């Protein structure tokens, strides 16, 4: 729609679902996709497969905008993560780079009980 060629591919992996978002060279989203975006409705949005489908979806949708090169940005430590990274690669888009940038507090907020007990 507005030719962008190169851009960023943000993978938001996790235990509950993977979701990728292709962006324009400076952060603004071109197109996005997720496990929900596709078929899977619940328990398997996380499955590595779903992650693949999503990543693939995100590509196509984004290649139509003229995309064809991306610096991947990995966030979150879930399943399907490394899988989507491979996906984007097998997709049209050229994976010009890869970077895990999962955020981590230098110790700020008391985590939910679900996440506490660790130290």
């Amino acid at each position: 729609k507005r030719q962008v060629a190169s851009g960023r591919a943000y993978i938001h992996a996790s235990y509950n679902n993977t979701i990728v978002t292709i962006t324009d060279p400076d952060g603004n989203p071109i197109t996005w996709s997720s496990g929900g975006v596709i078929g899977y409705k619940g328990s398997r949005k996380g499955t590595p497969y779903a992650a693949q489908l999503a990543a693939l979806d995100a590509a196509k949708k984004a290649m139509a905008y003229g995309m064809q090169s991306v610096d991947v940005i990995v966030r979150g430590t879930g399943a399907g993560r490394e899988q989507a990274i491979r996906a984007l690669q097998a997709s049209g888009l050229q994976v010009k780079s890869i970077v895990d940038d999962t955020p981590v507090p230098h110790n700020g907020c008391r985590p939910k009980k679900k996440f506490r007990k660790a130290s």
């Binding site: 990995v74 780079s97 890869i98 970077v99 895990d100 940038d101 230098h106």
Partner: protein, 73 residues
């Protein structure tokens, strides 16, 4: 397994207390702005201790980072 050189071996004399010598201070950081373990900085309980506080000084002055982005993968 940690079987290479130490940020100390690969280097000579330097002021562990010098918080401005960004040049050599950098050497003591991981692929990320994280302070290396004595395990690999080659330093000692005492030296490693002073480094830690010096690096922390540089960081506030903005000479060294607090955290970096991991490339590759």
């Amino acid at each position: 397994p940690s079987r290479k050189a130490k940020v100390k071996a690969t280097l000579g004399e330097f002021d562990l207390r010098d918080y401005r010598n960004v040049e050599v201070l950098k050497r003591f950081l991981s692929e990320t702005g994280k302070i290396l373990p004595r395990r690999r900085t080659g330093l000692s309980g005492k030296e490693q201790r002073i480094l830690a506080k010096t690096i922390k000084r540089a960081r506030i002055l903005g000479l060294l980072p607090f955290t970096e982005k991991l490339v590759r993968k």
